[PDB]
Amino acid sequence: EMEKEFEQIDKSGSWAAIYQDIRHEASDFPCRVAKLPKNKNRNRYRDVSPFDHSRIKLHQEDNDYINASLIKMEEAQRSYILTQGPLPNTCGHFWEMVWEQKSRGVVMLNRVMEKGSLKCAQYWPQKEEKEMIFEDTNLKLTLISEDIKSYYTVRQLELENLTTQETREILHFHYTTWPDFGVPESPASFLNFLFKVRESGSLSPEHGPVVVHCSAGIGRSGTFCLADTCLLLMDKRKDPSSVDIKKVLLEMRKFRMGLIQTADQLRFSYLAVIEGAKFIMGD
Ligand SMILES: [Mg+2]
């Protein structure tokens, strides 16, 4: 069981040590498309790049590049797209990816401004009557409704392909209370948010993969996917304590580098999975 594993690491304060073994053992694959000079302004951070083998391609002839990775968890029957927070010049590419991949939900785990700097472009409309048009990709985005809660906001958006005049409804799930420094003190509001995403149908296989992002698309975003997949595998398996968080995380790191950025985030992920196990074992 991992509940016991948690107490050992915490008793000996050896989280930084666990985290380093994960770093040394993580996969490394080429990211040649990301490092081409023509793509330098499509990357928010120089050291965070999608692997070539799992990167999402835009259906543009000119330049198909977006900093986004497909994470495929075969046993759990879950797929996720992890991406960076859009930049002023990639908002249109972001929504084009959502359209092309048939995603139903976008999960945002950061605020537009944190620590006094901009972490993400404001890529969705703030008022019903002021829609946004992305001229480069021929997409129109309208805010339909907005439900603000204490720890998160859910928005219904309408995405219209101006070329085909088709429209889809997209749900935007915005976790607004992640602290500027460190990790939340309790996983309760995080787990509540995760179960609301689940309940919406956005993670379900009838739809394209959910789009998940924070600023770099690896830290908070990694925590979200790791917790979801681990909890799903506990539902599925004959022996729920056969789920090894560390193994699951290394499998996900084959698809995008750097998932889980700090030892603090690793500890938090254990905590969320352990607490979430209470509700998945029928309570
Ligand atoms: Mg108003």
Curated annotation (Swiss-Prot):
One of its GO terms (biological process) is regulation of endocytosis. It is found in: Endoplasmic reticulum membrane. The modification Cysteine sulfenic acid (-SOH) is found at residue 214. It comes from the Eukaryota. Residues 2-276 form the Tyrosine-protein phosphatase domain. The modification S-nitrosocysteine is found at residue 214. Expressed in keratinocytes (at protein level). It is a peripheral membrane protein. The modification Phosphoserine is found at residues 49, 241-242. GO terms for molecular function: cadherin binding; enzyme binding; ephrin receptor binding; insulin receptor binding; non-membrane spanning protein tyrosine phosphatase activity; protein kinase binding; protein phosphatase 2A binding; protein tyrosine phosphatase activity. Oxidized on Cys-214; the Cys-SOH formed in response to redox signaling reacts with the alpha-amido of the following residue to form a sulfenamide cross-link, triggering a conformational change that inhibits substrate binding and activity. The active site can be restored by reduction. Keywords: Acetylation, Endoplasmic reticulum, Hydrolase, Membrane, Oxidation, Phosphoprotein, Protein phosphatase, S-nitrosylation. Tyrosine-protein phosphatase which acts as a regulator of endoplasmic reticulum unfolded protein response. Mediates dephosphorylation of EIF2AK3/PERK; inactivating the protein kinase activity of EIF2AK3/PERK. May play an important role in CKII- and p60c-src-induced signal transduction cascades. May regulate the EFNA5-EPHA3 signaling pathway which modulates cell reorganization and cell-cell repulsion. May also regulate the hepatocyte growth factor receptor signaling pathway through dephosphorylation of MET. This is Tyrosine-protein phosphatase non-receptor type 1. It comes from Homo sapiens (Human). The lineage of its organism: Eukaryota, Metazoa, Chordata, Craniata, Vertebrata.
